Amino acid sequence: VYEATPFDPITVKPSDKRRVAYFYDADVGNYAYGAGHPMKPHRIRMAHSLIMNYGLYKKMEIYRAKPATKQEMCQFHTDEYIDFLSRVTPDNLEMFKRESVKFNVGDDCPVFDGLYEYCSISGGGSMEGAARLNRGKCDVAVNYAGGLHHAKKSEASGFCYLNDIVLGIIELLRYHPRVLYIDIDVHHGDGVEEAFYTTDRVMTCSFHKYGEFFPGTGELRDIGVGAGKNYAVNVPLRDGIDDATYRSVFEPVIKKIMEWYQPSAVVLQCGGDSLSGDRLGCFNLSMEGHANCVNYVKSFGIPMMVVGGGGYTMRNVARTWCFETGLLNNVVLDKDLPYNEYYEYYGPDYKLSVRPSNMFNVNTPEYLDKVMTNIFANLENTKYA
Amino acid sequence: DSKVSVTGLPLNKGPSEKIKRESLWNDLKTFLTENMTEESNIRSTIGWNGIDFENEDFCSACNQSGSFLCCDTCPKSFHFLCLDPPIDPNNLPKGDWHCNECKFKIFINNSMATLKKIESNFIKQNNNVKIFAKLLFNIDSHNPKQFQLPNYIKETFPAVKTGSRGQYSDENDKIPLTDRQLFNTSYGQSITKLDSYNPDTHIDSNSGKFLICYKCNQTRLGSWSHPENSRLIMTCDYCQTPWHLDCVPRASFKNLGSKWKCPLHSPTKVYKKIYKVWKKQRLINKKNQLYYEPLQKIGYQNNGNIQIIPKITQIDENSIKYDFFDKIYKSKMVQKRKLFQFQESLIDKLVSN
Amino acid sequence: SQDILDLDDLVEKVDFYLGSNKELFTWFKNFVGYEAFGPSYKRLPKSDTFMPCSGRDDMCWEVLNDEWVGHPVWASEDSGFIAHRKNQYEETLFKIEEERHEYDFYIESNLRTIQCLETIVNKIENMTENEKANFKLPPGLGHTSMTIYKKVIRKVYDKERGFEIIDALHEHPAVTAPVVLKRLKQKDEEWRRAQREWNKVWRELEQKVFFKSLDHLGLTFKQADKKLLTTKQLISEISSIKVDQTNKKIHWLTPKPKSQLDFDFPDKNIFYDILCLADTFITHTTAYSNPDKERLKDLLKYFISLFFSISFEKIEESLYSHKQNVSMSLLDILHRSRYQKLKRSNGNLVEEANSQGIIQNRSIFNLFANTNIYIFFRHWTTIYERLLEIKQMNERVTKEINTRSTVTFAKDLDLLSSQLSEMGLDFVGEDAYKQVLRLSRRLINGDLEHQWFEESLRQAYNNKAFKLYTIDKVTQSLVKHAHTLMTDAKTAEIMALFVKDRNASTTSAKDQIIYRLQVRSHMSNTENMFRIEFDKRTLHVSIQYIALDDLTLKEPKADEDKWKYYVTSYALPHPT
Amino acid sequence: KISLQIPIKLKSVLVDDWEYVTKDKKICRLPADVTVEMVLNKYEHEVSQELESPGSQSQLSEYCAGLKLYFDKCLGNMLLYRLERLQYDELLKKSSKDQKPLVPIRIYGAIHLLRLISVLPELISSTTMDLQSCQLLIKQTEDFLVWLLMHVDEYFNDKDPNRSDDALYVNTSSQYEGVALGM
Ligand SMILES: [Zn+2]
Ligand SMILES: [Zn+2]
Ligand SMILES: [Zn+2]
Ligand SMILES: [Zn+2]
Ligand SMILES: [Zn+2]
């Protein structure tokens, strides 16, 4: 069903108007990771500056969500896991030589310190965003601090120590009947999918690279078991996918999902490792090729939340999230960056544009045709909600 | 504060002349925020309050590495689950801990006379089990260990080999990538996953001819002044019949864990779903397998363990032809008779009206 | 058949065998009368789905999922997770951003604790001495973050001494807060000065490696044009299309596959530009002599004019105008003696088969070629296709270069790379394609280094025009193969026969047959044959591989033309 | 060197166990439905129903008691893979919680007893036992193995625990591999 088509530039929809809410805790960036490893909250400060210097704060309300307590964290995790996280620190690691192995919290993804603090900040941000979405206060919640899909129930893998996506999704599911999670991060969000594998009130759609690639999960046959059959949509791609290919895959699949499943609330994970030049992600998307997905989801006009995610090169993810918050305010930003504290990050062009590489797009139209045919055949069964 | 960081020098210090020589050629608006953020605690759950002998570095019970408690009289070290009883690391034994071997030796005081005396007394006590008295005594004499199958069960089946740590390796394990230690070095960037290269990928190596795909019957090579018409041929590991990654819908080069098996292998497990299990046994070599060519070939059942020729039972093409057509025609007659019973019951209930 | 395998499972397992044949498999469908489905998740026994889970309400048991487990050690088969390549220049571009993250981390943390110490000192100052005597600071110092100040103090205060000053400040703020605040202020000012005096070098080393690490297909194009442009691969691509065409012809429902290679030439001026490139190269080249140089130029010009039906005077006037704005028959060329002399001088069924089919007003022409002419025409098509790509991007690229609003605030602080604007390699707002041509000529003659030309084409054509990186090596190749048509006697005579056929305006089928036979007489049986069919109306070129017993012309559509072809090929003493 | 002749199908069962309790990361579901107490009791009972001579029945019950005592004294020491021990240890701890001592004969299934039998050649080779007693014990265990080869379709069926229930094996969680395997 794949059809290669050119990429029309992004445009702001005239009638689709909405007030958004930008959750930012002034301390999110203060905690560095151990030694230059890929994540750092720092890329949430930088983005913020741009959103401030563009005069976007006059287009929305900026909030500060009070941090999540252990009682709210445990709505997904287990107590022993949360207690261990609450008391661990680089000083008292040798005291927990067994726990660090059972919970995998002291391995390749090690604990800096402020760990519990930063996790609580992200969780509270996501949960208050979901709550304000529920209370009819706004239509969009923007939190570039959450988006930790990789954390399991009693162990953290791949840096997502607290899986705040699931806490926020439950907070949403305290009112809303059907929630649609749209993952456009290059990786597979195995945490969320595993945590909603057997339910029909949550439909996940993960556009991820498949192959011998972390987390090694997310085939086309992973379609959910039990009552959750046909309610998990994995789209496994290959390297080098580009703006026109990604658009021609995303638009029809998402339109079909929104046409048959018909969610009442959307959670969009706008991770930044699916961009060209990122430290790990092996895609070749452009900034506008990424923001087109958010524009298309917003075109539907239902309650929607925008969460952060990966992103291991701070400059591209900062510029991307700035353009995303701009597009979410119905304003196409000028590509000349105003003066900010982190001006000298974005050399040497000092422009808002992210530039794709000439990486070879390996997704042949026959493969994507077969994939989207399989996916539409699966979605045939979700017509009756 | 004077301690060097990643940059090479103290943090409060500019670049040296050597770095800047070999690296050279020759109001804001987020002042605000503490004025616009107002806290949100609109959430529903806000009610929630919220002699010096060196010890061995391998666990002598399973020969692996980790954290292990050692003995004060023998260099043997044991993990905390590999003990009798398995000692919890939270509560270590206060004082010098000794292994079962050293404990036995010190209890006997290394005198064989007391050993034979206690052995005689022990074999005298449990007369009801006199066959096992010797070993029932000898059980408390040696250190624990994990259960490794004896070689005469691993050597009965040839397709079953013990891994590097004592793990099942059933010949369906690909291979370690030895020159993939050479891969971390690599050449440049023509890496494992074979991006942008099919000169010696759409071409049979030893023969020199073309690795055709069983489903489209054309090695699509395109041109390397037009490289968007390649299709990524990969050769299976069992049959060696090569497929395109678009004919076998998979999108990857299986390179790390297993051997790729084409859709041209039958099953090796079934789940009949009404959920009965395997029909294909193990390969019992050492040349002790019973090949029995039956004297009845048209109504045999015999296994799903067939071997084809022009207890594993040989068979020929015509026998399978006849069994298959027998199945088809018997099933056709069965369906016909079902429909006929339905129609006769229907006409009976119809004339009943 | 032993009732071990389900029926639908059998149909599915057989489709992978006979699904390539629709008739066999539809007859099979009519004749036979015809949990973990995801391979990554397990199921855990429902005795470990019972964990404390302090605050889970009734909803998060009805909606969530505790049974099925998944982990990146089960789905990786205990060994895996291969990664991307990320060439070295991107690693040098990542180290820089890591350095920036570290410095910014420490700066902002020191500032955030400095503000707290400042407000603490301000609040303790205006109190009375008695209140200062007993004033204590609770853990956290009235802030929402408990760890950042401890971290910064332990960083600047020798972590043991860091803890000492932390507890001394918690117990005795009125005496410890001012001195520690002054220490943090001094350290912060020093760190900021070091930060800027290092931040110059970050940008300096980012500029020279940024574009060189967003296009590194342009280093899999200096080895993918010196290894995939050889004659072996050149004939291998066309033989591969031949093999595909043959093994798909076995499937009768597959239509008759077309010619092997197809090229289209809508824009003719690119021929003039290629001739200019060749002129400059052979003029610079010292591998060939001046008389042989002129032979090469003349052969190139004349072959292009003849094949592509371009008037020689037009090519001459175009080359002449090109030479301004920067400041004899072909048979006499093929014969070296003629060149040197002229350069010093300055039944009834067969009757009907041969009468029907004589093409009047010849518009389609043919050429029969050994390896050398084919490789030469391949080089030509490769160069024309690359230059056509560039000349099709030219308009958008010029419009884009015309909108480059350079930030002067960075230019005055020498933050922007003037080095490519120093050598004049920057693309001024003039036409881009002509600048590409001029730069390629300058590289060919040796006026400009390869790396600077590459980076100019990279900064003007951000990722789309890497192909021209070998515009030297390909040109040297093409000219070299032209030198074959001047020295290879058999290929020279084949070119002579081609000229003889091309000058003829009318031909019959038997003319084409005697043409092919006279050409094949020049080559052995071990060499291959390629037929280049040129269509003057569409300017199309169709290269066809020749099977040694295949026909000279394309398979006719009518069985009457088939019988005429058979009989006219049978009338000649050559085996049909 | 003492030698024992296990049937081939029991060798296949032991090798499939080697598969499951190794890199499929499974463990045996405990307490198994049919333990070693029940298995050895039913075997002794059925064979005594056939045995005429009193000395033969005495030797039968003697060997059966001895084998039960070797289960009790061997399951912990030499019959558990590295992956399984935590389970055993856990049960051990639960014993100390309820003050009921752990005797494996009543908990562990036939497969660990079959592992014991498999090792028994080396055990008896580590003896000073006389030749005739060793051969008598070997013959007794071989008769038992023939009984087991007849009942290997009541005892050792496979069920693929990922899809129905109550199989002879169950899966482990990630924490289980973490603690047991890689401490
Ligand atoms: Zn990710
Ligand atoms: Zn161990
Ligand atoms: Zn010892
Ligand atoms: Zn194919
Ligand atoms: Zn295969």
How far apart are the CA of D123 and the centre of ligand 3, in A? Answer: 22
Q: How far apart are CA B191 and CA A315, in angstroms?
A: 28
User: What HEC string does C462-525 produce?
Assistant: CCCCCHHHHHHHHHHHHHHHHHHHHHCHHHHHHHHHHHHHHHCCCECHHHHHHHHHHHHHHCCC
CA A369 vs CA A235, A248, B216, D173: distances in Å: 12, 11, 16, 37
Q: How far apart are CA C295 and CA C336, in angstroms?
A: 9
Q: Is A150 among the residues known to form the active site?
A: yes
How many CA atoms lie less than 13 Å away from C430 in the CB half-sphere? 10
Q: How far apart are CA C55 and CA A123, in angstroms?
A: 15
Phi, psi of C64 (to 5 degrees): -75, -170
Residues β-bridged to residue C553: none
How far apart are the CA of A24 and the centre of ligand 3, in A? Answer: 60
Q: How far apart are CA B173 and CA A23, in angstroms?
A: 50
Instruction: List the single best residue of D171, D177, D179 to mutate versus C (max C Cβ within 10 A).
Output: D171
Of the candidates C1, D156, D146, the residue with the CA atom closest to the CA atom of residue B303: C1
CA A320 vs CA A246, A278, A282, A285, B136: distances in Å: 17, 12, 17, 11, 73
Region of residue B208 (left: phi > 0; alpha: psi -120 to 50; beta: else):
left
Q: How far apart are CA A188 and CA A206, in angstroms?
A: 7
For residues B66 and B79, is the Cβ–Cβ distance under 8 A?
A: yes
Query: Exposed/middle/buried for C516, CB within 10 Å: 0-12, 13-18, 19+?
Result: buried
For Cα atoms D162, D163, D167, give the angle at the middle one, nearest 5 degrees: 70
Residue reference for tokens 């207890």 = B311
Q: Which amino acid is at A336?
A: D
Q: How far apart are CA B277 and CA B269, in angstroms?
A: 7
Residues β-bridged to residue C374: none
Q: How far apart are CA D43 and CA D141, in angstroms?
A: 11
Cα B353 from chain centre: 66
Q: Which amino acid is at A271?
A: G
User: What HEC string does B200-257 produce?
Assistant: CCCCCCCCCCCCCCCCCCCCCCCECCEHHHCCCEEECCCCCCEEECCCCCCCCCCCCC
Q: How far apart are CA C100 and CA A345, in angstroms?
A: 8
D182 in contact with chain C, both atoms CB, cutoff 8 A? no
Q: H or E stretch including B320?
A: helix B317-352
Q: Which amino acid is at C391?
A: K
Residues of chain B contacting residue D108, judged by C-beta atoms under 8 Å apart: none
The DSSP output letter for B61 is T
Q: H or E stretch including B33?
A: none
Q: How far apart are CA B133 and CA C234, in angstroms?
A: 83
The answer to whether the peptide bond before residue B227 is cis (omega within 30 degrees of 0) is no
Query: Exposed/middle/buried for B47, CB within 10 Å: 0-12, 13-18, 19+?
Result: exposed
Q: Are A102 and D178 within 8 A, CB to CB?
A: yes
Q: How far apart are CA C433 and CA A158, in angstroms?
A: 48
Q: How far apart are CA A209 and CA A193, in angstroms?
A: 16
For residue C348, give both structure tokens: 């009834």
CA A384 vs CA A230, A231, A300: distances in Å: 12, 12, 20
Q: Are B5 and C102 within 8 A, CB to CB?
A: yes
How many CA atoms lie less than 13 Å away from B202 in the CB half-sphere? 26
- Largest alpha-carbon pair distance within chain A? 59
Kindly give, in sequence order, each residue whose CB lies less than 8 Å from that of residue C324, ignoring residues fewer than 6 positions away. none
For residues D146 and C21, is the Cβ–Cβ distance under 8 A?
A: no
Phi, psi of B101 (to 5 degrees): -60, -50
Residues β-bridged to residue C264: C540
Q: Which partners does chain D have (≥3 C-beta pairs < 8 Å)?
A: A, B, C
Q: Tell me the DSSP string of C32-75.
A: TT---SSTT-EE--TTSS----TT--SHHHHSS--SEE--TTTT
Give resolution, Å, one decimal.
Answer: 4.4
CA A232 vs CA A307, C70, C568: distances in Å: 20, 15, 67
* Domains delineated in chain A: 20-385 (3.40.800.20)
Phi, psi of C106 (to 5 degrees): -65, -40
Q: Tell me the DSSP string of A344-376.
A: GGSTTT-BS------------HHHHHHHHHHHH
Q: Are C194 and B323 within 8 A, CB to CB?
A: no
The answer to whether the peptide bond before residue A215 is cis (omega within 30 degrees of 0) is yes
Query: Exposed/middle/buried for A355, CB within 10 Å: 0-12, 13-18, 19+?
Result: middle
Supply the Cα-derived Rg of chain C in whole angstroms.
39
Residue reference for tokens 């900064």 = C459
Exposed e or buried b for every residue in B314-327, given b needs 16+ CB within 10 A?
A: ebeeebeeebeeee
**Which among D65, D121, D160 has CB closest to B129?**
D65
Q: Return the SS3 of C375.
A: helix
Of the candidates A173, A170, A171, A184, the residue with the CA atom closest to the CA atom of residue A247: A184
Residue reference for tokens 């009112």 = A175
Q: H or E stretch including C563?
A: helix C559-571
Phi, psi of C359 (to 5 degrees): -75, 120
Of the candidates A290, A251, A292, the residue with the CA atom closest to the CA atom of residue A272: A290
For residues A268 and A27, is the Cβ–Cβ distance under 8 A?
A: no
Kindly give, in sequence order, each residue whose CB lies less than 8 Å from that of residue C10, ignoring residues fewer than 6 positions away. C32
CA quadruple C173, C176, C179, C180: dihedral positive or negative?
A: negative
Q: How far apart are CA A200 and CA A105, in angstroms?
A: 32
Q: Tell me the DSSP string of C395-444.
A: HHHHHHHTT----HHHHHTT-S--HHHHTT-S--SS-HHHHHHHHHHHHH
Q: Tell me the DSSP string of B160-207.
A: -EE-SSS-EE-S-B----GGGHHHHH-SSS--TT--S--TTTSS-SSS
Of the candidates A60, A102, A61, A105, the residue with the CA atom closest to the CA atom of residue A86: A105
CA quadruple D17, D20, D23, D28: dihedral positive or negative?
A: negative
Q: Return the SS3 of C321.
A: helix
Residues β-bridged to residue A285: A275
Q: How far apart are CA A311 and CA A278, in angstroms?
A: 7
Residues of chain A contacting residue D183, judged by C-beta atoms under 8 Å apart: 98, 101
Q: How far apart are CA B302 and CA B294, in angstroms?
A: 9
For residues C126 and C159, is the Cβ–Cβ distance under 8 A?
A: no
Cα C354 from chain centre: 50
The answer to whether the peptide bond before residue A348 is cis (omega within 30 degrees of 0) is yes
Q: How far apart are CA A221 and CA A229, in angstroms?
A: 11
CA C455 vs CA A314, C446, C469: distances in Å: 25, 16, 10
CA A281 vs CA A34, A120, A234, A267, A275: distances in Å: 21, 27, 17, 21, 7
The bridge status of strand B307-308 relative to strand B314-315 is parallel
Of the candidates C422, C96, C452, the residue with the CA atom closest to the CA atom of residue A347: C96
CA quadruple B71, B74, B79, B83: dihedral positive or negative?
A: negative
For residue A332, give both structure tokens: 């196409």
**Closest ligand to Cα B83:** 2
Exposed e or buried b for every residue in B55-92, given b needs 16+ CB within 10 A?
A: eeeebbbbebebebbbbebbebbbbbbbbbebbeeeee
Phi, psi of C42 (to 5 degrees): -100, 180
The DSSP output letter for D180 is I
Cα A99 from chain centre: 29
CA C270 vs CA C315, C373, C380, C385: distances in Å: 11, 20, 11, 9
Q: How far apart are CA A351 and CA A345, in angstroms?
A: 11
Q: H or E stretch including D118?
A: helix D110-125
For residues A87 and B63, is the Cβ–Cβ distance under 8 A?
A: no
Q: How far apart are CA C134 and CA C132, in angstroms?
A: 6
Residues β-bridged to residue C545: C530
Q: Which amino acid is at A63?
A: Y
The DSSP output letter for A381 is G
Q: Which amino acid is at C563?
A: W
Of all residues in chain C, the one with the smallest CA distance to A112 is C151
For residues B243 and B215, is the Cβ–Cβ distance under 8 A?
A: yes
The DSSP output letter for A335 is S
Chain B segment 71-100 residues within 8 A of D by beta carbon are 79-82, 84-86
Kindly give, in sequence order, each residue whose CB lies less than 8 Å from that of residue B29, ignoring residues fewer than 6 positions away. A52, A53, A55, A57
Q: Tell me the DSSP string of D84-112.
A: THHHHHHHHHHHHHHT----GGGTSBHHH
Residues of chain C contacting residue D177, judged by C-beta atoms under 8 Å apart: 73
Q: How far apart are CA C370 and CA C377, in angstroms?
A: 11
For residues B67 and B82, is the Cβ–Cβ distance under 8 A?
A: no
Residue reference for tokens 């990361």 = D25
A210 in contact with chain C, both atoms CB, cutoff 8 A? no
CA D29 vs CA A297, B129, C49: distances in Å: 48, 30, 15
For Cα atoms A113, A116, A121, give the angle at the middle one, nearest 5 degrees: 120
Kindly report the number of other CB atoms within 10 A of residue C9's CB atom. Answer: 15
Q: How far apart are CA C223 and CA B199, in angstroms?
A: 13
Of the candidates C383, A71, B160, the residue with the CA atom closest to the CA atom of residue D15: B160
Phi, psi of A35 (to 5 degrees): -155, 65
Q: How far apart are CA B60 and CA B47, in angstroms?
A: 54
Helix pair angle (D54-78, D110-125), 10° resolution: 100
C1 in contact with chain B, both atoms CB, cutoff 8 A? yes
How far apart are the CA of A86 and the centre of ligand 5, in A? Answer: 51
A152 in contact with chain D, both atoms CB, cutoff 8 A? yes
CA C8 vs CA A3, C3, C13, C93: distances in Å: 32, 12, 9, 56
Q: Which partners does chain B have (≥3 C-beta pairs < 8 Å)?
A: A, C, D
Q: How far apart are CA A378 and CA A234, in angstroms?
A: 11
CA A331 vs CA A10, A60, A321, B326: distances in Å: 11, 12, 14, 73
Residues of chain D contacting residue C35, judged by C-beta atoms under 8 Å apart: 162-163
Of the candidates A98, A90, A96, the residue with the CA atom closest to the CA atom of residue A116: A90
Kindly report the number of other CB atoms within 10 A of residue B103's CB atom. Answer: 16
Of the candidates A140, A173, A175, the residue with the CA atom closest to the CA atom of residue A303: A140
Kindly report the number of other CB atoms within 10 A of residue A19's CB atom. Answer: 12
Residues β-bridged to residue A306: A142, A268
Of the candidates D50, D82, A319, the residue with the CA atom closest to the CA atom of residue B58: D82
Domain ranges in chain D?
A: 2-183
Least Cα separation, residue D9 to chain C (angstroms): 21
